[PDB]
């Protein structure tokens, strides 16, 4: 019991999602812009060498980010599950008693920066060139760790409450900055990776300075305390609880895409790593459309569970679903009528727009089904019972994906790329379907 500051708690619930989604739909899309408009520089004051440096260094970023993402997520499904179920002050506690574990790692990172940086880095396809870059990239980042962590937790929990809007602005803003911040060093100076890396710390600092405001200054949305608010609850236990499947999802994908970057450093030293980098943020970029919808419900389907209008949250979940789908099929179509013009950035041989696009062809006759497949995941999450969600990811990401590449690559070919995805994913979808007639309670409406 505290004071539920504006945002909502309202039951104006379709425009809830509507004007809870779009802020992700924007922020994300723009940080997706930054990603873009940043890298391309590093194809300039440096060529493609460091562009790999990054692409290898990359996963090691996500290593922490998964860790603070679990952290960030817990928060979001706790704090909403406790703002319908209105233990208002518990939230206050949580918030801070997370900031603990963060500041724990915001140090461990600092530590390993000075420690495990190289040790780990060198450990795979260490092209004497791209090596230094990744270091010169990674060294800053870890220093460095602190702002980074915070800002994602924060920009996650503020969704967990209601502020996808100021989220917008925890977002839009590093972006715009970073752009002009990089330009600054990378090009205008010549602090290449070396300093587009410090450009993006000065980014994640400058937000944090701001996030303190929207958490101290006119302590917006909610229960937000600062002196001894936190300590180290036995609540800690309770977010690692929510988060376990959260940091799995990444440390499933992340821990597997270091591999496919470095097994491809044994074949294509740098030519083929920059194009990994490339294929991602078109998955990711035109993931967003989905991704964003989910974070709407994240807290919506959060304080609605929380002993409130069970009635109207299914409304969320059916709608939730209902939308997604139309983007599932939307992307999917657009992802297989324009696999041509998107391989018109990949312009090379007339064989490149062949088995290059053959994978991209029916590799993704799956897409339209992916909608649910992921909606489901925030709705075992917006409702702290990720034990089934725990269950879930391990299918999609590992215990069905890997045990499919492997069973085509024993020997089945560049067919072992293709069938391995299309189909692994659909066993994952079929599976999910059953976890909801397992639980005729989320969607206890149709």
Numbering used by the authors: 3 to 448
Excerpt from the publication:
MATE proteins identified thus far can be separated into the NorM, DinF and eukaryotic subfamilies based on amino-acid sequence similarity.
We replaced DinF-BHD40 with asparagine, mimicking a constitutively protonated aspartate. This mutation abrogated the transport function, likely because the protein was trapped in a protonated state. The low pH-soaked structure of DinF-BHD40N is largely identical to the un-soaked one (root mean squared deviation (r.m.s.d.) <0.5 Å for 447 Cα positions), ascertaining that the protein was indeed locked into a protonated state. Tellingly, TM1 in DinF-BHD40N is no more bent than that of DinF-BH, suggesting the notion that TM1 is kinked in an extracellular-facing, protonated MATE transporter is not always applicable. In this network, the side chain of DinF-BHD40N forms an H-bond with that of DinF-BHD184. By contrast, in the deprotonated DinF-BH9, no such interaction was observed between DinF-BHD40 and DinF-BHD184.
